[PDB]
Write an enzyme that holds these catalytic residues in place. Sequence first.
Site, mmCIF file in Angstrom:
data_model
loop_
_atom_site.group_PDB
_atom_site.id
_atom_site.type_symbol
_atom_site.label_atom_id
_atom_site.label_comp_id
_atom_site.label_asym_id
_atom_site.label_seq_id
_atom_site.Cartn_x
_atom_site.Cartn_y
_atom_site.Cartn_z
ATOM 1 C CG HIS A 1 -6.968 -11.251 -15.793
ATOM 2 N ND1 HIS A 1 -5.903 -10.395 -15.617
ATOM 3 C CD2 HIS A 1 -8.025 -10.477 -16.132
ATOM 4 C CE1 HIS A 1 -6.299 -9.156 -15.856
ATOM 5 N NE2 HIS A 1 -7.585 -9.179 -16.159
ATOM 6 C CB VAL B 1 -3.972 -2.634 -1.007
ATOM 7 C CG1 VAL B 1 -3.706 -1.394 -1.886
ATOM 8 C CG2 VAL B 1 -4.539 -2.256 0.364
ATOM 9 C CG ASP B 2 -6.485 -1.664 -6.258
ATOM 10 O OD1 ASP B 2 -5.842 -2.730 -6.098
ATOM 11 O OD2 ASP B 2 -6.632 -1.112 -7.373
ATOM 12 C CD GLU C 1 -1.632 -9.613 -14.932
ATOM 13 O OE1 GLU C 1 -1.963 -9.138 -16.048
ATOM 14 O OE2 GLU C 1 -2.329 -9.500 -13.896
ATOM 15 C CB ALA D 1 -0.914 -0.017 1.211
ATOM 16 C CB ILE D 2 3.078 2.381 -2.580
ATOM 17 C CG1 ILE D 2 3.726 1.029 -2.260
ATOM 18 C CG2 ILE D 2 4.119 3.475 -2.875
ATOM 19 C CD1 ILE D 2 4.661 1.049 -1.063
ATOM 20 C CE1 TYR E 1 -4.062 1.592 -6.171
ATOM 21 C CE2 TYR E 1 -2.008 2.799 -6.537
ATOM 22 C CZ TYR E 1 -3.165 2.197 -7.028
ATOM 23 O OH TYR E 1 -3.430 2.199 -8.381
#
Length: 280
Positions: A168, A147-148, A238, A61-62, A65
């Site tokens: 996905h 985190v989102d 990814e 969480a940067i 975020y």
Amino acid sequence: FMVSLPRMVYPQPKVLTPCRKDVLVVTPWLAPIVWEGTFNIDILNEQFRLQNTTIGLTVFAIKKYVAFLKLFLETAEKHFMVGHRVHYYVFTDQPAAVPRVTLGTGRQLSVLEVGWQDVSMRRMEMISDFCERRFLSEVDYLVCVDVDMEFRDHVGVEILTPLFGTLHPSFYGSSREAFTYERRPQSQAYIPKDEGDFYYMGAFFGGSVQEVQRLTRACHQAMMVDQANGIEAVWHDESHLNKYLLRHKPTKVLSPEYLWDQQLLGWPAVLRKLRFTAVP
């Protein structure tokens, strides 16, 4: 060593009655694909509680975020591994912006302070390079998520296995040529048009600590090679995660119940539950 399960009363599985007929529930390398209806959570909870399983959940969480942490953590408390030992590891540039979320018994949270190319590599580097010994001593399984997001339904020990990826949500019905793999042969993440099982999401992978550290080490090394060669894979870590899971098959695959975006994709009939979802 594993002790015996206790007596349990539950419906008999029926050999000539599939749980799900509408979806693939096992990969061609005999890994379960985890969908609602395929598992009896009481049996699995027993198996994992008897081993006193501890699950680590890592989340970065940067900058802006950090605003997503409160909902992420509060909903994880409601839905993630309830009944089991959980250790959250929150990697952040703003330790003081981490909300004080009330945790159930047997659950703990550690805040780990962190300091463009390095930012892309940060997560894989952190899990394999700096946190290696800590994780081995503290947890049995590691789960790496974005985190989102928010939990909306059960996410439990049905996911645990040596190594898992998650389908996905934009690609589960797509042909492999449509997968957004890295397509340039100059990249370590390169996958040709005639290869690929699935397109896995970077937002949710995990496994035993040993296998997750192997994966993150390999991806970090591959990313450093690409950097040295002046190339950045189309979808960053990814793309590398996809290359790694092509060459090292996961021992479970999570269905898109486990990574969904309702605003973008609605609620198709094939999804009986929406478990972990993007925040609008």
